[model samples]
Target: TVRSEKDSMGAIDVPADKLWGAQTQRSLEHFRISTEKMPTSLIHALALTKRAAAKVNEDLGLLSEEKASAIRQAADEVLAGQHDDEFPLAIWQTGSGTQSNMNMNEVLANRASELLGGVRGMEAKVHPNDDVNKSQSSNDVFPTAMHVAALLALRKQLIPQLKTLTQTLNEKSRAFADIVKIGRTHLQDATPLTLGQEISGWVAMLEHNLKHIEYSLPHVAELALGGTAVGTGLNTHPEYARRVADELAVITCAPFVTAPNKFEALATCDALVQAHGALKGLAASLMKIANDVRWLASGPRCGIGEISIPENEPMPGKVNPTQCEALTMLCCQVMGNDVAINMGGASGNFELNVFRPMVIHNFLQSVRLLADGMESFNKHCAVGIEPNRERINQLLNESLMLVTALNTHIGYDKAAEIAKKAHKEGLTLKAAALALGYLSEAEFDSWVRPEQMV
Candidate 1:
């Protein structure tokens, strides 16, 4: 039922089956606060970090190649998700993330030792501290892992989805290009615009956000690894930090480099804050796009009804824009997460920032929400949009905003008078104009044209 594992302090009873030793066991037992375990992306990143460190240590002649190989194999297994159940520490534990870093080190070291014919909890062929985590500190490793995981999420998940959805909206814009519709400002009729021109605004929003979010990736790619415990690079060879970064770049296939100033890297998370700011820009874009779609597709008989979405429902004739609602709601959460990240970035005091775990958690969460929401909204609603031609034409023709065209001819004052007369008496603009003797029917026909407005 239990096995005794020894750290520097004393022996502690770890669960007999778990591969983790004392530090991991202690945190697992103490930080039992949340159902949220350390994120798997972070775990994969930690494993990659250790693997890179092991290679660097071996190259520097600090670790035996035998121990390095075993560590690499064990780290590979961790990456393959062969021991997911072993890492059970909460994200709410240490702000330094030392406990979680040891969680990775202990798990890998135990597995590597076992592979080398050593007992699991009983002594070491590979010491977790002097071997697996050599030439690195939790301060450096944790932030490096944060960057790697975040960039992977952006590359593998978020950016691709953003591109796909942007393409979808772009296509929608081109298809609807010539379809003229009444435009609204302040939820009241303002002027005329083509449906294609309207959707182009959404496409443009996505493109702009795509540029900014992509810009943040390069900034976050600078690793904090060589900085060691307090940005001094103590206990590490001169070439060790650079070599480890090289290993990470190869393993993760990203453009990673050593930070020019480890002190700044260790002290601040501005790159992440800037990245999350771009993500918030994305959320803002999605919110506006979803709101516009839902309102345009609001009703078949009673609401705006300029366009129709696929369908969602409870009432017989009502089609809900729940996809928009789902997307819009999550956008709200992304905005809230931005606030968390902003404060986290602000709290970087002196030589270290203590908000590491929370910053990465909320930042990764926003990236995920944004990517998934865009995909869902694109597939469910954006693709299925169909403009209501009759409705669009009806609203376009009836709108007195067309009187603006008359401002060039009869002037602004008479145009306003004509619009007011048409509104109050329920008369057509043509009828009101004829009654007022402002212009001939031929002149009215020549002047006011919705098709020309756009």
Candidate 2:
């Protein structure tokens, strides 16, 4: 069941049927720390890198046409996810992600050799380090792949999902426009605002967060390829970086550009750090929206009871805001990811950021979580929201803050007295004003209309 494969580190036992070489086998044996595999998006981007690099190298006369074509074919298989099992390194490998980079290299080399009737792990036709990784280093390639994966996910997944959530909120805002409710500040009755106004506020928050995400995108789109070893561009051709970016753009249908300064790109994770900050901002906004919805939908009988939520199982007659709960939990996770990303960004030293795997892993997780959370929330919560109009009207009528509208008609001092009397005695604002002899019933009726005030 086991066969031998040799790398600079010497021969290692590997599964005879597997496409991975000794470096990958050694990484697998040494790092059994976590069950988390490298994200598929990252893997796909790596494949794209190899595929594009092969073409670029062949065009520049740096690689043989036969091996280049074979490598492209192999990398395409990886891109299509056929060889996902061959790349089994844990995310907690070497902080530099050298193991992961080597893992991809070994897989592509072995697979490409197999395409040319060579045995797996042989690398006779396509050497892992020499041919496959011709002008690349793990330092530069890993960060480049991270950028590509993040940009693809942001453009294809997260941004669109947030737009859907925003649209749903907008639709709900219009639907709730005429439904007036009592508004609270500092957890106490303050004034009145329509349900539509509150929903519109959430929509505004989402729209702003959308712009924040869009703003952070160009930073993530910058690639660190062709910055071999220490951003020196030592072995790589001058045009390699630009050509690879163009090739990747064609492959992913997402625009990508080489980093203008390779040293800064390799040494600093500022773009990912900035992207995670935007994700955290969006998470905070979603948290507020979820918490607000849950609070508003708290209890059908005893709690705020201002809105109705769909009932799920576990408790009879309980309509829990389960979607809001999920969204809030995801928001918490994204905020936590942002902290890890911050530390990872700061982990870089002189030439290379050592904590790239952690940064990319957590960053991609946050993007996926937020995108999936928004989609689920939009479908299950935002679209199905129903106003408890009767309860809202009842609360509006009972609130002492309704006396605020009478402030101009009766002096603020008299309005405060009426509010105090209404709070002390279980009387409506109108009844309290009449009982206090501050205003006649007709004057109170004309001045203290909640709908008019809102």
The candidate scoring highest on lDDT is 1
Candidate 2 lDDT by residue in tens digits, 141-234: 8888899889999999999999998998899899999888988899988779999999999999999998999999888889999989999898
| C-alpha lDDT values of all predictions | 0.89, 0.87
Clashing pairs in 1: none
Off by over 4 Å in 1: 312-314, 407-417, 431-447
TM-score of each prediction: 0.94, 0.95
| lDDT digits (tens) for residues 142-196 of candidate 1 | 9989998998889888999999999998998999999999889999998789999
- Could you tell me how far off, in angstroms, the CA of residue 380 lies in candidate 2 after the best superposition? 1.4
Candidate 1, overall lDDT?
A: 0.89
Clashes of each: 0, 0
